[PDB]
Symmetry: D2
Subunit: 343 residues, 4 copies
């Protein structure tokens, strides 16, 4: 496979099944079933059609099963999944409430909302891991903290510090990242619902009521459509890379200390002690410091909708969040190997 993150043997190191299944094709589809189920619900709520009309759709989709073979033909002809998906969803709905699934929505609405739902789940996992790592890193500090360390400034031997002083550089920003993450989790995971041209034209002055209700049913923030406004994505991608950068600084520190060898002991048995995990921390930092540029180039999205900037997001964002989760997984592993800090 292309990415080490999913590779049959390289995921020995780079793996993260938990994060990666959020970006599985079944996970994506299931959120698009949840979008189309809630949209009918919200429209019945806001008097666009009746309730036994919405129930007809809701239990049609109940258990819907996608034909992955025809969906792939769907992105062949269309560039996009949703025409084919909707086409099958309608065939899954008895009567002529079938005509009314997807009403008022566009392909970007459902795709980006799906993305948002799963980014939300992904950030929860990341936060929990971040909290747990801060604690792990704190446990090291409370064990070895008063022990002396030789300072190193601009690649030279500096005056003596302590273990807790150097470890303040590992823990303190991770703590700030956890704060940034939880601030973002309030507003950031948003309903995408703009319709064909971003004006919700199939709903008139009922657009507001539908958007609010559909957002509530999906556990997502209500803000008006953001088809070309990719700031939120970019901002998110920045904290994903913020996390990898700090962890990479910690990895580089651990590797350096191992090469000098006098003030760290690593473990594995009860022996080569290659700081592979430490090195992999640097690699993941550098990867995400590259990928963040994709997400920023993708702020320039012309007109009402832009495939060129939107697809660059598809190419790159999932690997950024996976870089972040794997860096958390790898750092937690490196810390378990650190048996002594200090002289």
């Amino acid at each position: 496979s292309l990415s080490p993150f999913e590779h049959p043997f390289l995921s020995g190191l780079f793996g993260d099944s938990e994060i990666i299944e959020l970006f599985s094709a079944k996970a994506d589809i299931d959120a698009m079933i949840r979008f189309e189920t809630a949209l009918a619900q919200a429209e019945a709520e806001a008097s666009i059609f009746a309730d036994d009309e919405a129930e007809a759709i809701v239990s049609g989709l109940s258990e819907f099963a996608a034909d992955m073979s025809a969906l792939r033909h769907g992105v062949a002809k269309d560039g996009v999944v949703v025409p084919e998906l909707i086409r099958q969803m309608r065939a899954a709905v008895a009567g002529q409430a079938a005509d009314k699934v997807h009403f008022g929505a566009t392909s970007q609405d459902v795709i980006d909302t799906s993305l948002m739902l799963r980014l939300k789940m992904a950030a929860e996992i990341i936060a929990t891991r971040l909290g747990h790592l801060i604690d792990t890193l704190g446990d090291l500090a409370s064990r070895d903290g008063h022990k002396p360390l030789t300072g190193y400034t601009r690649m030279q031997a500096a005056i003596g510090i302590t273990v807790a002083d150097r470890a303040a550089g590992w823990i303190a920003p991770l703590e700030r990242h956890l704060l940034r993450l939880e601030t973002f989790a309030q507003n950031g995971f948003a309903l995408q619902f703009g319709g064909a041209a971003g004006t919700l034209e199939k709903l008139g002055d009922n657009a507001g009521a539908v958007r609010a209700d559909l957002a509530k049913r999906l556990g997502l923030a209500d803000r008006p459509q953001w088809h070309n406004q990719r700031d939120g994505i970019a901002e998110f991608a920045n904290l994903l890379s913020l996390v990898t950068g700090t962890l990479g600084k910690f990895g580089q520190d651990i590797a350096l200390m191992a090469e000098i060898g006098s003030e760290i002991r690593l473990s594995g048995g009860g022996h080569k002690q290659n700081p592979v995990n430490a090195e992999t921390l640097v690699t993941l930092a550098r990867f995400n410091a590259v990928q963040i540029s994709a997400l920023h180039q993708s702020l320039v999205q012309e007109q009402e909708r832009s495939g060129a900037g939107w697809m660059l997001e598809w190419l790159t964002l999932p690997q950024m969040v996976t870089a972040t989760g794997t860096s958390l997984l790898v750092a937690e592993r490196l810390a378990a190997q650190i048996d002594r800090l200090g002289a």
Copy 2:
């Protein structure tokens, strides 16, 4: 010169002398003067030395202009300005208070504080012009926004919208970036005060007091030393690219509108293209301040210096873009069909 922002003729497009003066040698020097004046006052307040010793530093460095040749030759000897700067700074203070300048401080303290101080002025200017352009664009939205527009999704003509619909996409994210900038400027501009190896080993228990009071006097946040913690710099740089990126979308919309040419009137759209340019510039440059997150040990020259090479041009590109978008808005005689 290498950069079109500062270039003797290319500045007619890319210039922004107001944001650039903030990165001059003189504005850096003056901010470093404000660091050591105030550091002396903070330590006098703390009771480390006396009080006429601080008063000597404060007024000794009141008329201070530095020999730049020697400064350059000092970074040519050291890699870093401050050991020579401090030498001249010491020669202007009479008596034993000359010994006390820079006490407890390192080079990274004075360099990073100076930067934060000038970045804060930079961010105010930026915040103002951003607030202004929201009003300028909002004006065009209420002047012209009743008018029909051919909508365009994925490079094909779609259903009709109005000017007010498309204007929303330019305005709304800018009001988000004002909000993001105002959130950041509460305490994103920090004092750097760590000492040689980030432990303020010269101050003892008094480290706490001095650091709070030195931050107080400079209008900077009191966050514990962040020599190898550059998370906030990267966050700040992200904001800088957020604005350029939104204005780049706006430049792109105006360029496409000019090319089709039946739903805009402009008084050829050089300004619109430059918005796309500056957007992609900063979108590249954001990478540099993320590769500089990996700052090894207690001080990395490698990571730190990459910030000297990239950060000003991020801020200037945001400044300039804010200037250029305003010139573009003034060019717009009409949005919408006839």
Copy 3:
């Protein structure tokens, strides 16, 4: 899945199973086996051990089946496939010939050489499609080259041009890229044979002779080891982004021509979105981001750097894949263009 190239549905636009198969574990292992077979042959040729011992290493590996699950645990602990891979390869060899596999070689030697063998097969596929695309675009440029276009400069109408005039900007850079690819293929796909810390300390004075034999046997180039020297990788990745940039320039032109919609006729019934056209711009921008990672990994410190080296693992296959997809997508695009010009 994570990349759209490999994704269960999105592959229907971003997919390229032919190029991607060259990055699958099965094809990677098969290159590694190939390296280890030829290594054994080359040492016994310079007479480091016996021939029917090397011949035991040949035929032992001929039926070899990897424990995929144990290979995984192998990089979990070691960080690299090879110590375990070699351990499974010794299980595949009967007799004291099993002591002689991977003699003189290091972990990076097998990995980098395995990549080089595979990059060679990708580049021959890329170069093949490139030449055919130039030929297809050349047929667009002959059908409609006489018809006039409105010139556009700096997002404004300029003077009249012809279709041939604007087609030259799609075709001429591709012909130059084809030439760049053929040139690179002569030396650029090297052997990696350095040993534990680059100097082939096991081999002694048989160093150069064995490396030459190993290079000839595997159809790669006889250069000294380049554990910490990644300039050829960077130079190749630049080529990958050069192709995508130009095809991006192509796809953007077609996208505008479709928006204005008077000087083009696109076909099928796929509305009528220029999806393939936009995709071309996307892939161009992708590789244009990625190329910087390959450049960040030029700084590989000391005798071997895990940090620099693993960054290449993360990013490089997606560069070759994007370039390969770009050629497919451009080919599909041009097959939808029925008329350029008024």
Copy 4:
């Protein structure tokens, strides 16, 4: 100033006045003058107009000085220097021969040609220096390359290698870049001459011959216009970065041998140069992406793509100039390698 390469104090570390001089406004205006001079001559020679007219243009421009203030104003008005420049250049020329200056040519023709003119001189200084450094690192190696080193693989102590071993990862990639720059310098620096939309439509049938002669006088390659074909720039940008990236590897190693401090010795008055090389390497590795994002230049001219090269490329060549200067300072400090 915005960049440390030009900075009143920081250029004590990052300065290259000799590379930076090629990017000055004066040295640019000089190049563009040469373009219009050579254009008029090439047009007289291809019989587009008469000798007497071409000579009036030559002698007008021979004592021509530019109004910088009005040029500044001119790009504020037009987005580009040339219209004002050409307007100023017509005033230098007497008679109706003034109408002929700039004939057939467009703003990008004179701008990109000028870039190409100065980049060729950048690349000659860079090649020369690169050859000289290759020598210094070789003098360094054969002085000390019998002395053993502790090898280091993936940040752990490995077996014994010698000083010459490690130095091959320094010298052998720089020798390949010298060859790459040599190769590029043959037909890599190209005359840009296409006209309003790239079709040289003013020149009719004489286009090839005007262009060939225009290219010959300016010492640049004759090739068809590349107003939207920026792969020559991209390739040159790759070369720049390749150089700084190898020098970055060199610096990183030197700093690690400095930190360990047992298998090196530095005459100092430590490893600032060593870290600077790493800085310039990760800088160029950043910038290379802009030049690659600039490959997408739409239609017959794209201001947005084109002006990204304006922002980034002068600093890439300067970083490559400075990295070379900086490695040469560092190499002059190393008195011993090995135990």
